[PDB]
Ligand binder design. Structure first.
Ligand SMILES: C[C@H]1O[C@H](O[C@H]2[C@H](O)[C@@H](O)[C@@H](O[C@H]3[C@H](O)[C@@H](O)[C@H](O)O[C@@H]3CO)O[C@@H]2CO)[C@H](O)[C@@H](O)[C@@H]1N[C@H]1C=C(CO)[C@@H](O)[C@H](O)[C@H]1O
Ligand SMILES: Nc1ncnc2c1ncn2[C@@H]1O[C@H](COP(=O)(O)OP(=O)(O)O)[C@@H](O)[C@H]1O
Length: 522
């Protein structure tokens, strides 16, 4: 019958979000509540969310070696309890709303992320014991028969604290932990000198231990250059410890799970740990409410599969005009939306421009990240009239692109699942994607086209060489040409309808989570 599920993360859309993590922790818990399970999320109170009330509960926790208290705020929406951990170090980092969750600059992290996120894991464990759930806390607390779902490296110490602080005294004796991995590139690698700040005994030292040549940039809150080394140096790795201490490790697509366990490249050095522990993938779904052509509240014309020829053409012409491009619904249009970071291959699209004019297509690119990627992005229209770059976070334009574009272009170098392609398919927009991770799972040949592989930099941190960049360009264009060969044909029309008929909701994947959860507690 009824499961008790407590999701712990740094992000819960629409309150806090830097990407897909927030969308999953919004959508999956809502679907689980819909099925009838008791579900809550726990995350930091980064802003004074209007629908959240102070519960008046205070809980002592450690902020590094300092003893401190958190307060818990509580909101309730669509059958899900959202618990927010309140502390000066979460709220007062910036007056700006839903910005700078992980650091002040783009790639730069707060020095004190160790203390901040260790404190989150400690604070979350008390929630099932203390916070009354339901509409206005009428349902009482979740209790000890709880499954903690730890999302990504930020919460990966929770299983250690569960054992050390609770189960060692006979509390939560039957509670379970699930490590839900969204992205293996970030693992909570910290210097070993930060061990004392965790307030854990030495019995967990071996699980935390790690050797590598690739450290993140040093904890000085400005330096952006990662520390590569000729020698392999000793450090801590939170995600490793999380894998070794959880009851089960999951991730966000079967093919990504395969990649992680199959090689040091795919698992970013945690492949053997993932193999040892076992790692299963479940492809993300998505919510339909905000993203569907029938009810979309931003685009110029709503449509469904029957009226796609009318409404989508109008959206296309609207996108074209909005971007300063020649208005003509017969020119195939490619749209990119994503972080301007190595993972997503925005640098490949920009570098591909000289070769792209030959294809007789339009390209629209929307993203934020590196100052000089953003500067390059905005300059693209000058040299290339068929293309347009916009360096902003802009939901309205994202909606215009998803509806108006013929193709959704994702030249990712790695992609645990991806969300753009799911949205795109619901709008009848055809994905053209890199053959990596969950893009392989979500875009079979009936729905879209695969590129050749976009090659990674020879080592992390190292800016990709002009050599490998150009291989990516060629690899992307192979995929685009495959797609353009069918553009405008009866097969094109059919592929759009097949995309729109493709069910990408949380219904099926949520059911798979429930099966895994039921096995853990029985
Ligand atoms: C979009 C992405 O958001 C989250 O990733 C965070 C990192 O967790 C956080 O540490 C920070 O990363 C910086 C890092 O700390 C720093 O040392 C390094 O030099 O620069 C990094 C900045 O790029 O910020 C990022 C971005 O906000 C989540 O942890 C990720 O899971 C999430 N992406 C995932 C999520 C999903 C949803 O399931 C997948 O669909 C998607 O394929 C995958 O990319
Ligand atoms: N500049 C932007 N403006 C608006 N939305 C964006 C922008 N960049 C990314 N997004 C949205 O953020 C989400 C990113 O999710 P996903 O595709 O899983 O990539 P990530 O790896 O960043 O999580 C998508 O839903 C995408 O539509």
């Amino acid at each position: 019958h009824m499961l008790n599920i407590c999701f712990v993360s740094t992000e819960v859309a629409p309150y806090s979000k830097t990407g897909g993590l927030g969308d999953v922790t919004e959508g999956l818990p809502e679907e689980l509540a819909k099925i009838g399970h008791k579900v809550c999320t726990v995350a930091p109170r980064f802003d004074q969310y209007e629908d959240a009330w102070d519960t008046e509960i205070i809980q002592p926790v450690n902020y590094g070696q300092e003893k401190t208290n958190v307060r818990y705020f509580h909101s309730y929406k669509k059958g899900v309890d959202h618990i927010w951990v309140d502390h000066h170090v979460y709220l007062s980092k910036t007056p700006l709303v839903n910005k700078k969750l992980y650091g002040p600059k783009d790639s730069v992290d707060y020095i004190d992320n160790v203390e901040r996120f260790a404190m989150l894991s400690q604070a979350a464990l008390a929630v099932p014991l203390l916070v009354p759930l339901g509409a206005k806390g009428s349902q009482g607390v979740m209790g000890e028969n709880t499954i903690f779902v730890c999302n990504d490296w930020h919460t990966s110490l929770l299983p250690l604290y569960l054992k050390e602080y609770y189960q060692s005294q006979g509390i939560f004796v039957n509670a379970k932990t699930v490590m839900l991995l969204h992205n293996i590139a970030f693992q909570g690698r910290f210097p070993s000198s930060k061990f004392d700040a965790l307030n854990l005994p030495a019995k967990y030292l071996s699980d935390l231990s790690f050797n590598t040549q690739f450290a993140p940039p040093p904890l000085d809150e400005k330096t952006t250059e990662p520390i590569t080394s000729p020698e392999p140096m000793y450090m801590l790795n939170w995600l490793k410890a999380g894998f070794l201490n959880c009851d089960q490790a999951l991730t966000v697509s079967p093919n990504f799970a395969h990649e992680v366990t199959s090689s040091p490249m795919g698992g970013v050095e945690l492949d053997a740990v993932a193999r040892d522990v076992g790692l299963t993938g479940i492809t993300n779904g998505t919510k339909i409410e905000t993203w569907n052509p029938q009810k979309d509240k931003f685009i110029l014309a709503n449509y469904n599969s029957r009226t796609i020829n009318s409404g989508k053409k109008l959206c296309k012409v609207a996108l074209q005009k909005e971007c300063g491009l020649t208005v003509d619904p017969d020119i195939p249009l490619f749209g990119f939306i994503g972080r301007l970071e190595n993972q997503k291959g925005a640098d490949v699209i920009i570098a591909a421009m000289p070769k792209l004019k030959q294809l007789n297509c339009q390209v629209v690119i929307l993203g934020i990240g590196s100052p000089k990627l953003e500067q390059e992005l905005e300059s693209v229209a000058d040299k290339y009239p068929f293309a347009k770059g916009v360096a902003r976070f802009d939901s309205k334009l994202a909606h215009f692109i998803t509806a108006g574009a013929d193709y959704c272009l994702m030249p990712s170098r790695f992609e645990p699942c991806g969300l753009n392609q799911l949205y795109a398919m619901m709008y009848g927009t055809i994905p053209v994607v890199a053959p990596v991770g969950g893009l392989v799972d979500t875009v079979p040949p009936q729905f879209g086209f695969l590129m050749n592989k976009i090659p990674m930099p020879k080592i992390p941190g190292v800016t990709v060489s002009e050599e490998l960049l150009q291989q990516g360009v060629d690899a992307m264009i192979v995929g685009m040409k495959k797609a353009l060969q069918e553009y405008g044909t009866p097969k094109f029309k059919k592929m759009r309808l097949d995309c729109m008929a493709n069910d990408v909701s949380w219904k099926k994947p949520a059911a798979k989570y429930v099966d895994i959860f039921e096995q853990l507690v029985n």
